[PDB]
Amino acid sequence: RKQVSDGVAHIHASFNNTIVTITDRQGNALGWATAGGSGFRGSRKSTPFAAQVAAERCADAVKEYGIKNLEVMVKGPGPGRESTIRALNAAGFRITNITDVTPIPHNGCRPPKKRRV
Amino acid sequence: EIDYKDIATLKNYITESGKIVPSRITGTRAKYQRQLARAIKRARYLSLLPYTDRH
Amino acid sequence: RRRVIGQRKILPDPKFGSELLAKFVNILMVDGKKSTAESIVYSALETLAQRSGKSELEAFEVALENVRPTVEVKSRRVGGSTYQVPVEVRPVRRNALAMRWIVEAARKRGDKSMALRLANELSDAAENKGTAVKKREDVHRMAEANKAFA
RNA sequence: UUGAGCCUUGAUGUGUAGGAUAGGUGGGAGGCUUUGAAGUGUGGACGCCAGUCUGCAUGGAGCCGACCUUGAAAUACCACC
RNA sequence: AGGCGGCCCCCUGGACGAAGACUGACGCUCAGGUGCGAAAGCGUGGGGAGCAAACAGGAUUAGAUACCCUGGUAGUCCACGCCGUAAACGAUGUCGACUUGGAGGUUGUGCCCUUGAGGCGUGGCUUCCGGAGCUAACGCGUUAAGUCGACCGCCUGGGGA
């Protein structure tokens, strides 16, 4: 139950939800928060108004692990992809590294051609 | 077209984002971006360069 | 449209004092007799100072601190989408909006005397105990989700 | 390696006022702890923020009673729950 | 033609330049033939991430059998074998000569110690803007719907069909 004080964090932001995880370098998820957790419907869940109020709800999910130094990984296009990071910095945590890992389309299967209006 | 197997040279033309440096930025003619894309493909199929990026 | 005349700047009074007290004796004027409110202004405070606050000097300060609108709600549309939207209120007249919500209820309620119809209203206003405020808050609470847009 | 039950063992335990966290309870001056007490907190649980346990910073045989004084009742040493 | 982008190794049609040469009208077109296929479809055996007819739901609505959302088989892929049709479209049959351009791309190549980065030329293919001419009009415009000739394929109002 001593604090670990060092680790990693993973950010996901899609066009329909922001999902943030505080992780371990072994690939474990230690605590999580979702922007649909604020009760908001549809693409609201991808805005800073939703993503900025998931960060300290994610810091609450590791309250017995104890955090201080974090290395961040970020994926997805959603607007909330950085306000959730600044809100976590403003919670009293210190970012050791920031890296973007958003995929570049490879094969991609089938796209909308043929796109909804 | 020339020296495309040297990766210590080729890494001056490709980004940390896993992409390519524009010909506007290297100051080069349009067909140098084709020469560069061919160098990239000819380094990929020779085990000199990776095919993809991400952590 | 955009013009519209420039909105007014009101006035203070050489006896009633501040711009809001000069508004209190001029708002909700009916029948134009203009001698009724000068016996009701700062005259409901001596019992308020022993019911829902202290002193005749803070009895009306606290009423416009307990009745404090910070957000307005209104419909907004953009083509084929409509939302109820929340907007922060401008501070400069904020306490005059709160004043209006008290002096009108003394007219819209008809129970015993006018020497009671405002004093009985103010003693709940100095406590944020207005009519149906739970369902009023339920609209602003529902509109909060629309500051996240679509 | 562990699901489940069961044995085994430790921390407990206070208010109020005063030194004093007396759990209950039956005896009671030479007997006991070395895989253990101190520090008093960094930090973990609980909290009267004191203290104890997990485990350290850490050491490492002691200690305790008189005078003083609380209370039905005592504070080494030793059962029982 | 329809269509076709990877790197790497074979097999291969056609077109095109430089400087010459050997045949001697051997050319141009073409009914019916003789051979091609994009999507979809039919056959025999495999295949199944993503997309999705059909289908079953959510709905929505007056109703929803559909849009929109949740799932989803056929079909898409391959061994091949069939099918022969298209807004197969710059809606312009094939073939040849004559003749204002500009801007630009793409590929050979003649020449000046290329002492050559440069400059002066010159064939092939081809995009956009447009002039004389043509056209009802828009467009075609030296890659002409122009100027003129050889041959072939077609055709004489919709509604019905």
XYZ file of C-alpha atoms (C1' of nucleotides) in Angstrom:
564
model
C 0.000 0.000 0.000
C 2.985 2.442 -0.297
C 2.532 4.843 -3.190
C 4.174 3.954 -6.563
C 4.600 7.641 -7.549
C 5.679 6.787 -11.182
C 3.929 5.236 -14.232
C 1.985 5.695 -17.477
C -1.393 6.943 -18.717
C -3.462 6.266 -21.878
C -5.851 8.687 -23.553
C -8.500 7.725 -26.163
C -10.753 10.283 -27.823
C -13.198 9.174 -30.595
C -15.993 11.122 -32.306
C -18.492 9.584 -29.771
C -16.517 9.092 -26.483
C -13.399 10.095 -24.475
C -11.996 7.214 -22.452
C -8.974 7.748 -20.166
C -6.957 5.122 -18.373
C -4.165 5.224 -15.790
C -1.975 2.282 -16.695
C 1.094 0.221 -15.885
C 4.074 -0.383 -18.265
C 3.070 -4.116 -18.173
C -0.227 -3.209 -19.976
C -2.548 -3.205 -16.871
C -5.364 -0.681 -16.475
C -5.226 0.590 -12.843
C -8.156 3.029 -13.052
C -10.446 4.450 -15.744
C -12.889 7.244 -16.558
C -15.375 7.759 -19.451
C -16.934 10.973 -20.688
C -20.372 9.215 -20.937
C -19.922 8.957 -17.126
C -21.084 12.610 -16.924
C -24.472 11.386 -18.390
C -24.013 13.313 -21.654
C -25.615 11.970 -24.898
C -23.917 11.577 -28.323
C -20.775 13.507 -29.475
C -20.997 15.707 -26.273
C -18.791 12.936 -24.851
C -15.891 14.101 -27.144
C -15.869 17.815 -26.103
C -13.599 19.465 -23.441
C -16.803 20.175 -21.358
C -17.013 16.386 -20.917
C -13.310 15.328 -21.181
C -12.044 18.018 -18.692
C -14.360 16.432 -15.997
C -13.054 12.891 -16.533
C -9.426 13.579 -15.405
C -9.871 13.893 -11.600
C -12.497 11.080 -11.835
C -9.610 8.996 -13.264
C -7.135 10.182 -10.560
C -9.809 9.005 -8.037
C -9.663 5.506 -9.658
C -5.976 5.059 -8.534
C -6.416 6.640 -5.027
C -4.749 3.666 -3.303
C -1.915 3.250 -5.935
C -0.548 6.806 -5.489
C 0.671 8.755 -8.529
C 3.055 11.674 -9.255
C 5.180 11.115 -12.436
C 3.260 10.014 -15.623
C 4.231 9.142 -19.243
C 1.249 9.840 -21.538
C 0.058 8.072 -24.745
C -2.682 9.760 -26.834
C -4.923 8.316 -29.626
C -7.982 9.343 -31.626
C -9.287 12.558 -33.224
C -11.815 13.709 -30.498
C -11.582 17.418 -29.361
C -11.182 16.404 -25.643
C -7.686 14.858 -26.473
C -5.720 17.555 -24.461
C -8.072 19.237 -21.865
C -8.267 15.922 -20.053
C -4.405 16.059 -19.886
C -4.195 19.670 -18.599
C -6.929 18.887 -16.010
C -4.805 15.972 -14.798
C -1.674 18.203 -14.643
C -3.787 20.732 -12.649
C -4.726 17.931 -10.206
C -1.076 18.077 -8.890
C 0.557 15.456 -11.187
C 3.759 15.889 -13.290
C 4.072 14.646 -16.883
C 7.392 12.878 -17.616
C 6.626 12.496 -21.378
C 3.813 13.159 -23.889
C 3.626 10.952 -27.046
C 0.903 10.826 -29.731
C 0.118 7.301 -31.043
C -3.000 8.001 -33.164
C -3.204 5.458 -36.058
C -2.536 6.322 -39.693
C -5.116 4.380 -41.833
C -3.616 1.086 -43.108
C -5.867 -1.121 -45.282
C -8.837 0.703 -43.582
C -11.363 -1.950 -44.869
C -14.346 -0.052 -46.427
C -15.001 3.721 -45.990
C -18.288 5.656 -46.331
C -18.459 6.580 -50.090
C -21.688 6.663 -49.620
C -21.600 8.878 -46.477
C -24.676 9.743 -44.303
C -26.293 13.179 -44.672
C 17.831 7.208 -57.833
C 21.030 7.543 -55.680
C 22.270 6.424 -52.224
C 18.748 5.221 -51.138
C 20.138 2.426 -48.933
C 21.724 4.935 -46.470
C 19.267 5.310 -43.547
C 21.464 7.917 -41.734
C 20.656 10.073 -44.779
C 17.010 8.893 -45.272
C 15.967 9.760 -41.618
C 16.498 13.446 -42.473
C 13.403 13.151 -44.804
C 10.870 11.212 -42.559
C 9.051 12.384 -39.371
C 8.604 11.264 -35.736
C 4.825 11.305 -36.544
C 5.523 8.299 -38.893
C 5.089 10.316 -42.116
C 7.183 12.162 -44.788
C 8.804 15.651 -44.793
C 7.110 17.747 -47.527
C 9.077 18.834 -50.663
C 8.081 22.425 -49.732
C 10.195 21.995 -46.559
C 13.269 20.300 -48.141
C 13.092 22.900 -50.923
C 13.162 20.072 -53.543
C 11.426 19.550 -56.913
C 8.197 17.461 -57.132
C 10.035 14.390 -58.574
C 12.394 14.349 -55.564
C 9.289 13.524 -53.448
C 8.782 10.599 -55.919
C 12.503 9.680 -55.649
C 12.072 9.815 -51.813
C 8.854 7.693 -51.890
C 10.720 5.151 -54.116
C 13.705 5.243 -51.717
C 11.264 4.564 -48.801
C 9.557 1.636 -50.683
C 13.002 0.270 -51.803
C 14.305 0.485 -48.205
C 11.093 -1.215 -46.836
C 11.409 -4.240 -49.199
C 15.164 -4.526 -48.335
C 14.907 -4.620 -44.465
C 16.556 -1.163 -44.229
C 13.400 0.778 -43.190
C 10.200 -0.151 -41.175
C 6.843 -0.301 -43.048
C 4.843 1.321 -40.168
C 5.163 3.478 -37.003
C 3.388 3.685 -33.518
C 4.906 2.721 -30.179
C -32.794 44.329 -35.586
C -29.422 46.014 -34.622
C -31.032 49.477 -34.226
C -32.912 49.529 -31.654
C -32.188 52.591 -29.461
C -29.393 52.506 -26.861
C -30.728 51.043 -23.613
C -31.156 53.464 -20.676
C -28.787 54.157 -17.691
C -31.494 54.808 -15.004
C -30.906 57.134 -11.964
C -30.224 57.369 -8.189
C -32.534 59.494 -5.926
C -31.643 62.504 -3.581
C -33.606 60.811 -0.703
C -34.084 57.108 -1.543
C -30.293 56.932 -2.326
C -28.975 54.156 -4.617
C -30.085 53.281 -8.198
C -31.755 50.057 -7.015
C -33.752 51.857 -4.241
C -34.714 54.471 -6.790
C -35.913 51.466 -8.951
C -37.816 49.819 -6.033
C -40.147 52.869 -5.703
C -40.749 52.908 -9.521
C -41.050 49.232 -10.588
C -44.474 47.477 -10.780
C -46.261 50.799 -10.849
C -50.027 50.294 -11.383
C -52.818 52.890 -11.275
C -49.974 55.577 -11.274
C -50.839 56.960 -7.733
C -47.098 57.225 -6.884
C -47.312 57.426 -3.030
C -47.734 53.769 -2.036
C -44.181 52.368 -2.283
C -42.520 55.190 -0.206
C -44.200 53.608 2.897
C -43.093 50.058 1.897
C -39.404 50.734 0.892
C -36.902 49.813 3.648
C -39.959 49.269 5.971
C -40.115 45.441 5.825
C -36.533 45.137 7.248
C -36.960 45.644 11.054
C -38.893 42.323 11.334
C -36.597 40.658 8.705
C -33.667 41.554 11.037
C -35.399 39.253 13.605
C -36.809 36.553 11.188
C -34.359 35.857 8.244
C -31.293 38.136 8.802
C -29.762 40.879 11.045
C -29.884 44.697 11.151
C -31.854 47.064 8.954
C -28.422 47.691 7.266
C -27.889 44.058 6.003
C -31.561 42.766 5.848
C -31.820 43.676 2.105
C -28.151 42.929 1.188
C -28.700 39.274 2.186
C -32.022 39.034 0.291
C -30.224 39.916 -2.990
C -27.411 37.542 -2.034
C -29.774 34.570 -1.420
C -31.786 35.436 -4.553
C -28.862 35.389 -7.040
C -29.485 34.313 -10.677
C -26.110 33.341 -12.315
C -27.515 31.557 -15.447
C -30.400 32.119 -17.908
C -31.970 29.349 -20.105
C -33.306 29.747 -23.668
C -33.963 27.618 -26.835
C -31.314 27.727 -29.592
C -31.523 26.061 -33.044
C -29.131 25.531 -35.995
C -31.089 24.091 -38.946
C -32.766 20.750 -38.062
C -31.392 20.665 -34.454
C -32.890 22.446 -31.345
C -31.459 22.680 -27.803
C -32.366 24.327 -24.487
C -29.090 26.305 -23.810
C -27.661 27.869 -20.544
C -25.983 31.353 -20.635
C -24.219 33.267 -17.788
C -25.954 36.515 -16.782
C -24.247 39.934 -16.916
C -23.433 41.259 -13.362
C -24.241 44.993 -13.609
C -28.098 44.622 -13.250
C -28.043 41.135 -11.680
C -29.405 42.341 -8.287
C -32.252 44.306 -9.952
C -33.535 41.086 -11.610
C -33.566 39.448 -8.167
C -35.407 42.486 -6.685
C -38.198 42.158 -9.328
C -38.874 38.519 -8.416
C -39.804 39.639 -4.821
C -41.882 42.796 -5.385
C -44.109 41.079 -8.027
C -44.979 38.139 -5.791
C -46.475 40.580 -3.193
C -48.939 41.547 -5.986
C -49.576 38.051 -7.470
C -50.301 36.643 -3.962
C -53.474 37.994 -2.269
C -53.330 36.978 1.378
C -54.198 39.289 4.354
C -52.693 42.837 4.155
C -50.041 44.623 2.009
C -48.249 45.202 5.359
C -47.810 41.382 5.251
C -47.795 40.414 1.462
C -44.160 41.699 1.009
C -42.717 41.066 4.497
C -43.932 37.439 4.262
C -42.263 37.165 0.787
C -38.913 38.726 1.865
C -38.516 36.380 4.844
C -38.352 33.416 2.386
C -36.234 35.341 -0.192
C -33.542 36.054 2.467
C -33.379 32.235 2.798
C -33.617 31.210 -0.964
C -37.086 29.584 -0.195
C -38.991 30.772 -3.310
C -42.014 28.931 -4.866
C -41.346 25.828 -7.031
C -37.505 26.380 -7.121
C -36.815 22.617 -7.209
C -38.472 22.320 -10.666
C -36.875 25.627 -11.737
C -33.423 24.208 -10.902
C -34.416 20.951 -12.767
C -34.471 22.968 -16.055
C -31.006 24.598 -15.586
C -29.651 21.218 -14.478
C -31.018 19.605 -17.703
C -29.689 22.440 -19.892
C -26.147 22.114 -18.362
C -25.608 19.065 -20.661
C -26.168 21.264 -23.731
C -22.971 23.322 -23.045
C -21.359 20.223 -24.657
C -23.247 21.032 -27.911
C -24.572 18.203 -30.240
C -1.075 -22.185 -7.530
C -5.450 -21.241 -4.981
C -11.987 -21.368 -4.481
C -14.527 -23.037 0.100
C -15.080 -24.345 5.292
C -12.265 -24.914 9.979
C -8.405 -24.480 13.485
C -4.381 -20.720 15.208
C -2.829 -15.863 16.597
C -2.347 -10.331 17.008
C -4.356 -5.364 17.069
C -7.898 -3.852 19.651
C -10.818 -1.707 24.085
C -10.195 5.613 25.795
C -14.753 9.527 26.171
C -16.118 13.169 30.455
C -11.629 15.214 34.880
C -6.382 14.410 36.561
C -1.229 11.738 35.966
C -2.961 7.993 33.054
C -6.693 4.578 26.233
C -7.174 0.481 33.685
C -11.357 -3.807 27.627
C -13.475 -7.569 30.593
C -11.838 -10.657 34.775
C -9.495 -14.077 38.845
C -4.952 -14.337 41.481
C -0.440 -11.210 42.593
C 6.956 -8.791 44.015
C 10.816 -10.391 42.365
C 9.785 -12.206 37.188
C 9.879 -11.491 32.062
C 10.802 -9.961 26.707
C 16.475 -11.051 22.291
C 11.860 -13.369 15.601
C 12.231 -7.330 20.850
C 10.870 -2.461 23.424
C 12.473 2.606 21.970
C 11.509 6.912 17.504
C 7.659 9.506 15.770
C 7.152 9.914 12.010
C 8.357 9.862 6.182
C 4.374 6.946 4.440
C -0.280 2.665 4.663
C -5.079 1.411 7.523
C -7.970 3.165 11.712
C -8.219 7.781 14.601
C -10.116 11.312 20.319
C -4.141 12.776 15.552
C -2.743 9.946 20.574
C -1.320 5.096 19.487
C -0.711 0.290 17.374
C -0.061 -2.944 13.440
C 2.044 -3.747 7.923
C 7.187 -2.470 7.201
C 11.258 1.141 7.926
C 14.577 5.423 9.598
C 16.436 1.892 13.268
C 18.670 -0.673 18.127
C 19.169 -4.624 20.620
C 18.141 -6.056 27.431
C 15.384 -4.543 29.633
C 12.059 -2.890 32.977
C 8.391 -1.829 36.689
C 6.579 -0.319 41.866
C 7.406 3.636 46.565
C 6.484 9.432 46.920
C 1.797 11.181 44.064
C -3.243 9.978 43.302
C -7.847 8.271 40.140
C -11.566 4.683 40.762
C -16.574 -0.618 41.986
C -11.752 -1.985 40.403
C -4.710 -0.763 39.030
C -0.370 0.534 36.136
C 5.850 -5.638 37.547
C 4.340 -11.280 36.932
C 0.633 -14.906 35.545
C -4.676 -17.422 34.070
C -9.404 -17.147 31.856
C -13.167 -14.495 27.708
C -11.667 -1.174 -75.332
C -13.344 -2.583 -70.452
C -9.655 -1.172 -67.410
C -4.483 -0.951 -64.857
C -0.533 2.073 -59.460
C 3.562 -1.485 -54.195
C 8.625 -3.892 -54.176
C 11.105 -8.161 -56.388
C 12.207 -12.232 -60.441
C 10.907 -14.133 -65.241
C 7.679 -14.257 -70.044
C 5.635 -10.743 -73.649
C 2.385 -7.367 -77.438
C 2.553 -2.191 -79.342
C 4.504 2.536 -79.788
C 8.965 6.053 -80.151
C 14.371 8.619 -81.373
C 19.225 9.087 -83.651
C 22.414 8.100 -88.521
C 21.686 4.864 -92.565
C 19.602 0.829 -95.889
C 16.922 -3.411 -98.449
C 11.925 -4.466 -101.046
C 8.924 -2.052 -104.835
C 1.772 -0.117 -104.349
C 3.066 -5.104 -100.858
C -1.782 0.266 -99.450
C -7.260 2.546 -97.011
C -11.950 0.325 -95.651
C -15.032 -4.039 -94.563
C -21.192 -7.482 -94.677
C -21.225 -12.000 -92.260
C -17.095 -13.831 -89.303
C -12.928 -14.305 -85.469
C -11.676 -12.961 -80.336
C -12.378 -9.510 -75.873
C -16.147 -7.723 -70.319
C -17.167 -3.349 -65.883
C -20.686 -4.151 -61.839
C -24.384 -7.695 -61.206
C -25.967 -13.053 -62.459
C -25.491 -18.739 -63.503
C -22.281 -23.577 -62.334
C -18.697 -27.103 -59.184
C -15.696 -26.737 -54.653
C -13.548 -23.500 -50.991
C -14.039 -18.599 -48.454
C -15.901 -15.117 -44.837
C -12.321 -9.423 -40.945
C -14.992 -4.898 -43.353
C -19.396 -3.273 -46.418
C -24.097 -5.022 -47.042
C -29.135 -6.245 -50.563
C -32.984 -9.730 -48.396
C -34.413 -10.285 -43.333
C -35.535 -9.511 -37.945
C -35.671 -5.495 -34.525
C -35.323 -0.221 -32.661
C -38.050 3.187 -34.002
C -40.177 7.443 -36.205
C -45.306 8.227 -37.741
C -51.565 9.151 -39.165
C -49.033 4.584 -41.191
C -43.365 2.993 -41.962
C -43.689 -2.337 -45.026
C -38.581 2.922 -46.215
C -35.067 7.367 -44.714
C -32.278 7.151 -39.708
C -30.016 3.691 -35.828
C -28.827 -2.142 -33.793
C -27.827 -6.886 -35.697
C -27.196 -9.646 -40.679
C -27.278 -13.925 -45.074
C -26.677 -13.385 -50.560
C -22.952 -10.904 -53.101
C -17.810 -9.032 -52.886
C -12.392 -13.140 -52.713
C -10.089 -17.840 -55.202
C -9.739 -22.542 -58.530
C -11.750 -21.928 -62.797
C -15.992 -22.453 -66.403
C -19.904 -19.401 -68.232
C -22.507 -14.562 -69.418
C -21.478 -11.035 -73.147
C -24.071 -6.162 -71.631
C -22.938 -0.207 -69.611
C -23.963 7.373 -68.758
C -18.755 1.067 -72.387
C -19.250 9.078 -72.545
C -14.864 14.633 -74.549
C -22.728 10.725 -76.139
C -17.900 12.927 -81.930
C -17.078 5.365 -87.088
C -12.147 4.113 -89.598
C -8.232 6.293 -92.897
C -4.975 10.568 -95.300
C -3.416 15.455 -96.515
C -3.473 21.224 -95.597
C -3.383 24.967 -92.140
C -2.689 31.326 -86.449
C -1.266 30.378 -81.509
C -0.287 30.600 -76.113
C 0.657 28.215 -71.363
C 2.149 23.460 -69.609
C 3.331 18.316 -68.849
C 5.808 13.810 -70.455
C 9.905 10.843 -73.475
C 13.741 10.227 -76.927
C 17.478 13.140 -79.427
C 21.016 16.751 -83.157
C 24.962 20.511 -81.804
C 28.657 24.321 -79.175
C 36.316 21.856 -75.648
C 28.199 20.490 -73.944
C 35.529 21.824 -71.016
C 27.997 23.173 -69.345
C 25.317 24.118 -64.448
C 23.968 26.973 -69.502
C 22.507 28.084 -74.689
C 20.791 26.859 -79.695
C 17.483 23.152 -81.847
C 14.128 18.739 -83.041
C 10.914 13.960 -83.454
C 6.807 11.025 -80.312
C 2.702 11.374 -76.913
C -0.845 14.949 -74.673
C -3.690 18.774 -70.956
C -5.954 23.584 -70.450
C -7.242 28.606 -72.722
C -8.835 29.949 -77.606
C -8.544 32.432 -83.191
C -10.038 31.798 -89.113
C -13.788 28.027 -90.333
C -18.220 24.864 -88.731
C -22.743 24.679 -85.747
C -29.761 26.220 -84.216
C -27.117 26.790 -79.730
C -23.782 25.093 -76.623
C -19.413 23.235 -78.244
C -15.496 21.279 -82.154
C -11.376 24.240 -82.636
C -4.271 21.872 -86.503
C -5.410 15.995 -81.545
C -11.198 20.457 -85.407
C -17.954 19.021 -85.213
C -12.761 22.923 -90.132
C -10.996 22.181 -95.517
C -11.741 17.812 -98.725
C -11.567 12.621 -100.502
C -12.073 6.399 -99.992
C -15.052 2.734 -97.393
C -18.256 0.885 -93.795
C -22.377 1.103 -90.176
C -27.446 3.637 -89.725
C -32.038 6.845 -90.058
C -37.038 9.689 -91.012
C -42.366 12.417 -84.984
C -44.047 11.203 -79.576
C -48.396 8.133 -76.791
C -48.612 2.830 -78.078
C -43.521 -0.259 -78.170
